[PDB]
Amino acid sequence: QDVVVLGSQEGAMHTALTGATEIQMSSGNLLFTGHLKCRLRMDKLQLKG
Amino acid sequence: FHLTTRNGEPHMIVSRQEKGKSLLFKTEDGVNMCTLMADLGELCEDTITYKCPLLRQNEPEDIDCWCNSTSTWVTYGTCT
Amino acid sequence: FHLTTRNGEPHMIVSRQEKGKSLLFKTEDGVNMCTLMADLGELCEDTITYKCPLLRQNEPEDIDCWCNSTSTWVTYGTCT
Amino acid sequence: MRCIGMSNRDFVEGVSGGSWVDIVLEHGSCVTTMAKNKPTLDFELIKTEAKQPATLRKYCIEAKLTNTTTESRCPTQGEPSLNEEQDKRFVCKHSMVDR
C-alpha cells in the first residue's frame, strides 16, 4: 500500500492568517504596545549643581 | 541484493541494478526464486518494505513480487 | 516481447515476464537496447502506449523507458 | 530633546510636597514632570514584551515519510500487526483488501 504526505502548509497557513492582527517580535520575544499608569515620588531627588 | 532476515524470515534489500532480473538465493529447502516486477529505484531514505508470497501453480494477482519456494520480505528505494 | 511497428518506428509489446530485464532487438543501425523501468503488469485491455526516447550520454529524467540507439514505442498492460 | 520633539507630551506637577504624582505612559508619548526645587524629568515607555511565555501546542506544517512497511493476512486469520505500530514516530492505518 502506498502512503504519501501532503506538501508544506506554510502557504495555506499564511494566506489563511491574513486579517488577524500581526505581532512584531525579536530575539524570540513578542512585542506589544503597552499602556501604563504609574505613581512617582521625588523626595529623594535634588538639583544637580 | 543484500540477504538478511526479518523475524526468522528471509529479507531482500534490492538495489537499482537488479531491476528486471530473477532473484535467487539458497535455502535449506532448496533454491528460492523470487520475481520482482515493481517503481523500483535507487536505494535511499524513501524505502518501502513488504512481502513476496509463496505461489505454487497459481497465477499472480494484484502483486508485483512473489517467490516460488519460500515467502520472502523485500525492500527497495524509490529514488531516481 | 512482440516486436512490431508504429508508423515506421519500432514498437514493443512487453509482457509481464519481462519486467526487470534489458530489452534487446536488432536494427539496421546495430543492436538496440531499451531499458524499461515502469506499474508494468499483465497484458490486458488496460494498455498504455508511449515512447522511449533515444538517450546518448545523458542521465534520464522524468521517464521510465529509454533506448540507446533508436527511439522505440512501448506498450504494456497494467492488470495483475 | 527627544520629549520636546514629540507631539504627544504631558506636563505633570505635584500639588503637594513629598506626595505621589500620577502619570500615564503610552508608546510614542512622553511625560514631563516638574516640582519646586526638583529637576524636571522626562518619562517614556519604549518597550513592552513578553518573556518566555508558556508554549501551548506545536503544530507540524511540513513532514516527510520514510520506511513505509506493509503487512497483511488472508481472509479468516484476524487483524495483522506490525510492532512499529507501537512506535510513536510512525503513522499507521488498518484496512481490508481483497485476497
**End-to-end CA, chain D:** 85
Structure resolution in Å? 9.8
Cell of residue D16, nine digits: 503637594
Contact residues on chain B for C21, CB-CB shorter than 8 A: 20-21
B69 in helix, strand or coil? coil
DSSP state of D16: S
Contact D28, A5 (CB under 8 A): no
Contact A39, D55 (CB under 8 A): no
Of D65, D69, D72, the CB nearest to B49: D69
Could B61 and C40 be called an inter-chain contact, meaning their C-beta atoms sit closer than 8 Å? Answer: no
D68 and chain B: CB distance < 8 Å anywhere? yes
Show the 3-state SS of chain C.
CEEEEECCEEEEECCHHHCCCCEEEEECCEEEEEEECCCCCEEEEEEEEEEECECCCCCCCCCCEEECCCCEEEEEEEEC
